[PDB]
């Protein structure tokens, strides 16, 4: 068992640990990107549903008035 | 069974169905609000972790050079 193994082994540990942290930072950044994209997707769904809801809202709202709003 | 029940019953159905759609629109809007808030939370975690990672990055990076970068 060479003594230098300590230095080689020491760095090896740092690479493994650092690599883990590096991925954690990158993974989080990816989540933010996906989060933003997900939000836009909701806008599309909400936009269409909101528009449709409004159309029906007028239809039902009109009928509601007959009974008593 | 009064005939008018049809009108009363008709509106009742509309209120239940419309109410469901109304909540769906509001629920989605809430999701967007929470989504944005969640993103900021990630910034705080990433910001701190990123800063700490950088500090360690210099420490380990410096050591890596001794072995061979």
Swiss-Prot record, chains A, B:
<protein>
    <recommendedName>
        <fullName>Unconventional myosin-X</fullName>
    </recommendedName>
</protein>
<comment type="similarity">
    <text>Belongs to the TRAFAC class myosin-kinesin ATPase superfamily. Myosin family.</text>
</comment>
<feature type="coiled-coil region">
    <location>
        <begin position="5"/>
        <end position="41"/>
    </location>
</feature>
<comment type="subunit">
    <text>Monomer, when in an inactive conformation in the cytosol. Homodimer in its active, membrane-bound conformation; antiparallel coiled coil-mediated dimer formation. Interacts with ECPAS. Interacts with NEO 1. Interacts with VASP. Interacts with DCC and ITGB5; the presence of DCC inhibits ITGB5 binding. Interacts with tubulin; ITGB5 or DCC binding inhibits tubulin binding. Interacts strongly with CALM3 and weakly with CALM, the CALM3 interaction is essential for function in filopodial extension and motility. Interacts with ITGB1, ITGB3 and ITGB5.</text>
</comment>
<comment type="function">
    <text>Myosins are actin-based motor molecules with ATPase activity. Unconventional myosins serve in intracellular movements. MYO10 binds to actin filaments and actin bundles and functions as a plus end-directed motor. Moves with higher velocity and takes larger steps on actin bundles than on single actin filaments. The tail domain binds to membranous compartments containing phosphatidylinositol 3,4,5-trisphosphate, which are then moved relative to actin filaments. Regulates cell shape, cell spreading and cell adhesion. Stimulates the formation and elongation of filopodia.</text>
</comment>
């Amino acid at each position: 068992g060479s003594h230098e193994n300590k230095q080689v082994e020491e760095i090896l540990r740092l690479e493994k640990e650092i690599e883990d942290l590096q991925r954690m930072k990158e993974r989080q950044e990816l989540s933010l990107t996906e989060a933003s994209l997900q939000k836009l997707q909701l806008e599309d769904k909400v936009e269409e549903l909101l528009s449709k809801n409004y159309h029906l809202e007028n239809e039902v709202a009109r009928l509601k008035k007959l009974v008593g709003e």
